[PDB]
Design a protein around this ligand. Structure first.
Ligand SMILES: CCCCCCCCCCCC[N+](C)(C)[O-]
Ligand SMILES: CCCCCCCCCCCC[N+](C)(C)[O-]
Ligand SMILES: CCCCCCCCCCCC[N+](C)(C)[O-]
Length: 421
């Protein structure tokens, strides 16, 4: 789902995040729907983390004859999560949490033949949420939240085999027999594959709000609607390219060369708004069913465009994403006072139109299968453990002068410790 993340808690991870927003067995869920606060009778704490181990691979052959094979370009991630919920009174409550709604990590060896569109891509996001909720009656509750998002990002691209390709072309041309052409070819050949073609890094804060509506027929059946506003991060960081400035202003498809000099850069990153409808049904003292449909407006992510203090475009990449949906269904089986078991299935559509696919964001439609279990220590303290398997469809990628093919899957493991005072 682009670079969107749903791992806000270990439980739920075991649910395949189905019906989040309509379930409140532990404090984690307030982060997804502030209205659920009215479901807590006392200060409740939750904290843990999810290890995401992706297995994304790239295959292909370049016009240079070199392999575009790149195994495991998606590094494993560690997504912590922490929550606290507290009643103000039988009418209002509040909560605070630290989670990750967005993130991405793609890494190619700097000598990768397709380095110009490979290299390194890292996006780290942290969401600090503060919420409040109001219960109107036995059925309706309302929640509103404020969010402060800290983001650390870094982008690096390399020459790859472009120098070789350029040299080849010059040499196959009438210019190949000329002094100017030869000097040109020498230079092109001289551009090593690990030559840093572009560098972009920065950290910045963004702000957004969210809200939720909870409606419960009774104490065992509820539905929810939530909205997470878009969050715009206005980066002000550093840009550079180790290429010689003599490369500039010819119209070449290459980021602005700065002779290695660092230049101040601006880039706005749009973090997509999200909508979600949820349902939780406890059809028995030991069985509950949960499901949801989420809609993330990825069309809000149109491009990555870095700009200089003069307003010149130093680096630009069209993304052209489209809105996407996510569907999830799961059930929880409360065996006894100590044990609770859960499973889930989910499907999230990729927001990237085929012609806009890039190897930097190896996304694709995903199917999730998961299982988890929770051990209750004493009606006040518990531990959650969940696992999920992600399987994605292999797709073709045409980027620049290259044709790639990618496949990706993933294993997720998480644990969270819960405590209610
Ligand atoms: C068509 C322009 C070719 C310019 C190459 C520059 C040589 C110095
Ligand atoms: C000061 C500029 C800082 C730029 C770092 C921006 C990172 C944006 C992360 C989104 C994913 C990047 N990608 C793959 C689309 O290029
Ligand atoms: C002495 C300049 C060394 C930098 C090499 C830059 C070559 C730019 C050629 C682009 C012609 C199209």
């Amino acid at each position: 789902a682009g670079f969107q993340l749903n791992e806000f808690s270990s439980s739920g991870l075991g649910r395949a995040y189905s019906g989040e927003g309509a379930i409140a067995d532990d404090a984690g869920n307030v982060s997804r729907n502030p209205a659920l606060i009215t479901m807590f009778d006392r200060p409740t704490f939750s904290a843990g983390a999810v290890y995401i181990d992706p297995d994304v691979n790239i295959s292909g052959t370049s016009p240079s004859g070199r392999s575009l094979k790149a195994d495991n370009i998606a590094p494993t991630e560690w997504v912590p999560n922490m929550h606290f919920v507290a009643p103000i009174n039988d009418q209002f409550g509040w909560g605070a949490s630290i989670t990750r709604n967005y993130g991405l990590a793609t890494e190619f060896n700097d000598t990768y033949a397709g380095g110009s569109v490979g290299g390194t891509t890292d996006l780290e996001t942290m969401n600090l949420n503060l919420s409040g909720a109001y219960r109107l009656n036995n059925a309706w509750s309302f929640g509103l939240g404020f969010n402060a998002v800290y983001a650390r990002a870094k982008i690096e691209r390399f020459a790859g085999d472009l120098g070789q390709l350029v040299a080849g072309q010059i040499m196959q041309s009438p210019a190949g027999q000329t002094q100017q052409g030869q000097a040109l070819a020498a230079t092109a050949n001289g551009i090593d594959s690990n030559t840093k073609i572009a560098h972009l890094n920065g950290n910045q804060w963004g702000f957004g709000w969210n809200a939720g509506i909870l409606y419960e027929l009774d104490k065992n059946n509820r539905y929810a609607l939530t909205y997470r506003s878009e969050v715009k991060i206005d980066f002000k960081g550093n840009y550079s390219s180790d290429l010689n400035r003599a490369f500039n202003n010819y119209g070449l498809p290459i980021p602005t060369a700065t002779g290695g000099a660092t230049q101040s850069g601006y880039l706005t990153l749009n973090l997509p708004e999200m909508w979600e409808v949820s349902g939780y049904n406890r059809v028995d003292p030991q069985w509950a069913i949960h499901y949801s449909l989420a809609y993330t407006s990825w069309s809000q992510f149109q491009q990555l465009k870095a700009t200089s203090t003069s307003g010149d475009t130093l680096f630009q990449k069209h993304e052209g994403f489209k809105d996407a949906y996510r569907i999830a269904l799961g059930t929880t089986y409360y065996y006894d006072d100590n044990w609770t078991f859960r499973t889930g299935i989910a499907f999230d559509d990729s927001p990237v139109p085929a012609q806009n696919r890039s190897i930097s964001i190896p996304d694709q439609d995903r199917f999730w299968l998961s299982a988890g279990t929770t051990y209750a220590f004493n009606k006040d303290a518990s531990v959650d453990v969940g696992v999920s398997y992600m399987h994605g469809q292999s797709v073709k990628i045409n980027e620049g002068p290259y044709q790639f093919e990618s496949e990706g899957k993933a294993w997720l493991f998480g644990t969270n410790f819960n405590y209610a005072f």
